[PDB]
Amino acid sequence: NYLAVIKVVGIGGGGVNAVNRMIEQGLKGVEFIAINTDAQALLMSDADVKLDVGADPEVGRKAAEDAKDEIEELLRGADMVFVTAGEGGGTGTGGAPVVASIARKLGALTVGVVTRPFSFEGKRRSNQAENGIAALRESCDTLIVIPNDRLLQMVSLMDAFRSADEVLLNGVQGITDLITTPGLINVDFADVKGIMSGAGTALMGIGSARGEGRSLKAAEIAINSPLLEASMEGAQGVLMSIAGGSDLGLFEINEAASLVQDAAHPDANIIFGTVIDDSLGDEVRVTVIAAGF
Amino acid sequence: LAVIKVVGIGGGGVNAVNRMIEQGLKGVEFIAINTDAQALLMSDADVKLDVGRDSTRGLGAGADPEVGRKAAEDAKDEIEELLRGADMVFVTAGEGGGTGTGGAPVVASIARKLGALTVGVVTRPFSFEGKRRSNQAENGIAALRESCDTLIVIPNDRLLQMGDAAVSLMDAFRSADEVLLNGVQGITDLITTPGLINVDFADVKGIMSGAGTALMGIGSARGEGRSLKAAEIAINSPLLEASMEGAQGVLMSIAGGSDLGLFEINEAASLVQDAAHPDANIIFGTVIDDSLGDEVRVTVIAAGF
Numbered sequence: 197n198y199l200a201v202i203k204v205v206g207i208g209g210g211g212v213n214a215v216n217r218m219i220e221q222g223l224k225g226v227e228f229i230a231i232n233t234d235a236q237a238l239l240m241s242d243a244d245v246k247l248d249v250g251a252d253p254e255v256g257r258k259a260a261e262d263a264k265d266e267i268e269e270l271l272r273g274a275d276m277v278f279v280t281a282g283e284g285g286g287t288g289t290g291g292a293p294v295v296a297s298i299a300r301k302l303g304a305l306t307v308g309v310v311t312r313p314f315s316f317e318g319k320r321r322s323n324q325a326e327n328g329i330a331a332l333r334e335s336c337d338t339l340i341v342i343p344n345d346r347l348l349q350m351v352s353l354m355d356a357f358r359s360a361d362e363v364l365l366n367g368v369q370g371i372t373d374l375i376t377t378p379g380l381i382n383v384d385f386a387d388v389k390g391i392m393s394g395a396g397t398a399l400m401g402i403g404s405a406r407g408e409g410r411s412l413k414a415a416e417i418a419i420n421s422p423l424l425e426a427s428m429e430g431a432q433g434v435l436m437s438i439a440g441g442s443d444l445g446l447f448e449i450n451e452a453a454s455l456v457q458d459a460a461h462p463d464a465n466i467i468f469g470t471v472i473d474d475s476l477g478d479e480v481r482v483t484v485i486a487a488g489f
Numbered sequence: 490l491a492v493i494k495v496v497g498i499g500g501g502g503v504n505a506v507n508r509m510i511e512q513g514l515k516g517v518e519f520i521a522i523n524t525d526a527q528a529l530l531m532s533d534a535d536v537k538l539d540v541g542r543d544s545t546r547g548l549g550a551g552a553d554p555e556v557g558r559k560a561a562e563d564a565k566d567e568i569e570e571l572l573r574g575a576d577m578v579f580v581t582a583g584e585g586g587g588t589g590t591g592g593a594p595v596v597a598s599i600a601r602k603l604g605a606l607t608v609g610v611v612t613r614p615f616s617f618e619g620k621r622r623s624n625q626a627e628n629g630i631a632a633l634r635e636s637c638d639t640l641i642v643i644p645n646d647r648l649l650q651m652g653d654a655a656v657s658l659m660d661a662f663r664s665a666d667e668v669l670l671n672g673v674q675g676i677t678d679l680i681t682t683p684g685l686i687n688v689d690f691a692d693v694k695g696i697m698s699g700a701g702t703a704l705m706g707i708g709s710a711r712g713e714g715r716s717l718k719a720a721e722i723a724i725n726s727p728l729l730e731a732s733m734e735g736a737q738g739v740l741m742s743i744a745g746g747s748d749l750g751l752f753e754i755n756e757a758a759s760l761v762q763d764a765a766h767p768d769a770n771i772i773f774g775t776v777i778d779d780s781l782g783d784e785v786r787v788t789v790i791a792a793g794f
């Protein structure tokens with residue numbers, strides 16, 4: 197109800213791994229759920245709730261369909277549900293749309309997070325990665341798509357893989373912190389629900405800066421992020437969060453908010469807020485989520 | 490800032506990883522892979538992956554390396570997803586069983602495909618464990634050698650020529666855990682907690698890339714002439730199998746407290762140079778470890794025979 201109930205579901209090996217990284221990094225205010233979808237292997241998790249329903253998406257779908265009642269029990273009462281298969285493919289890409297449709301049929305605000313692999317990784321048959329996206333799209337309120345190729349314009353191979361993991365985690369945290377963790381400017385969850393319900397595909401931009409003019413700088417970087425693929429101009433829904441320390445000033449906060457308004461489409465809904473994270477020092481971190489056209 | 494991951498595969502490797510964690514090895518991520526779910530519940534590793542669940546039903550590979558290989562191969566995408574982002578990957582196991590023997594080369598190949606500096610650290614079984622385990626270890630080692638930049642092989646038989654003569658079997662395997670820790674830590678601490686002489690990731694990569702098959706020696710000592718003593722012990726270690734003189738590549742680590750001075754470091758280094766092959770490439774590095782007290786610990790990795 198008033199403290200929103202947010203459930204983050206990692207499904208398949210990539211999804212469970214994503215959730216374990218969220219746990220290791222101290223992501224707060226959410227319940228973690230790890231769903232293993234493979235018969236032959238189990239990735240363990242320190243998630244609160246675990247379900248072992250076990251490289252084919254079709255296998256993952258059936259496994260989740262078969263466990264639909266149990267998954268529904270786990271999700272019941274959630275105001276918001278994140279679903280991700282994380283990096284890599286496999287059975288998780290088949291199971292994710294099932295978890296999403298259960299969440300949504302229950303009335304929860306349902307947010308998918310999906311990555312497009314780097315082009316250098318090649319491609320498995322049937323266009324199955326794109327098929328995974330479309331299935332998840334049909335099944336979510338908002339699907340946040342992270343095109344990993346765009347990271348190479350923001351690099352060694354190890355750096356590329358690490359960037360991919362970082363932005364994936366932020367695909368959840370940027371939004372959840374805005375809701376769960378107080379800052380000077382707080383948001384109404386109903387407006388989040390208002391802007392994200394039925395919104396469809398979304399893209400994300402991030403930006404970071406320190407010291408002098410940091411909030412404007414980080415915001416300008418986020419808004420121009422290659423991960424947004426220049427979707428900012430035409431976006432009809434924009435969520436923006438600025439994370440920083442307690443000393444984050446209202447004037448500098450408002451400058452960033454003004455910038456995003458000036459860059460967004462005239463008719464865009466804009467949800468804006470701040471997050472206090474005193475671990476950041478004199479750094480601020482902006483997350484922008486753009487949806488619609 | 491190098492990302493280092495240490496994989497323990499099979500019961501022996503997972504037990505060694507547990508030992509590494511218990512002894513406070515820092516700056517590395519610990520990954521445990523096994524075909525036994527209950528055994529993995531006891532692991533303190535950061536990442537725990539249970540493999541070959543259909544084929545083994547959580548009971549191990551029954552000493553059949555083919556089962557271990559297929560279990561790891563079946564989980565190769567998952568394993569790759571766990572390793573992605575690593576600059577360096579260690580793969581440790583006791584060779585001779587099914588899971589480690591069969592699975593370790595799969596993990597190493599994935600690491601090497603990703604371009605991570607890939608170092609295997611494995612034991613040969615004790616002769617008393619039987620000829621099938623020795624033969625299986627021998628095949629597992631050749632296989633793992635194809636997949637690693639450097640493969641450090643520790644003959645468990647030589648461990649019985651070290652430490653105490655009244656050891657039990659459990660104490661013997663515990664010494665195996667320790668030596669595996671020593672081989673990993675001897676290398677990783679250069680990078681993660683350097684002393685006065687800094688050997689960084691690029692230096693380690695320079696000497697360990699494609700170095701091939703390797704042997705290790707360890708020594709420690711306290712008090713007067715500790716550094717000379719520790720170095721002579723390591724140089725003469727049974728684990729080095731009297732092959733120090735033939736090695737074209739040597740990486741040496743000397744660990745001590747913050748007050749370990751250059752004179753001492755250099756005495757040990759001089760001793761090792763003198764004992765080395767004339768054309769040897771030797772890299773000398775130091776480690777800060779403020780828990781060591783008055784002791785210093787010298788590790789030698791010999792390759793290129």
Ligand SMILES: Nc1nc2c(ncn2[C@@H]2O[C@H](COP(=O)(O)OP(=O)(O)OP(O)(O)=S)[C@@H](O)[C@H]2O)c(=O)[nH]1
Pocket residue numbers: 498499500501502504505524548549550551552553582583584585586587588589590612613614615618622645662663665666669
């Ligand atoms: N370092 C260490 N080595 C061990 C330990 N127990 C056994 N070993 C060594 O490792 C070898 C392989 O044993 P183990 O690792 O337990 O098999 P496995 O790889 O898990 O293979 P399995 O599934 O067929 S049971 C043994 O032959 C022995 O030499 C241990 O606790 N610590």
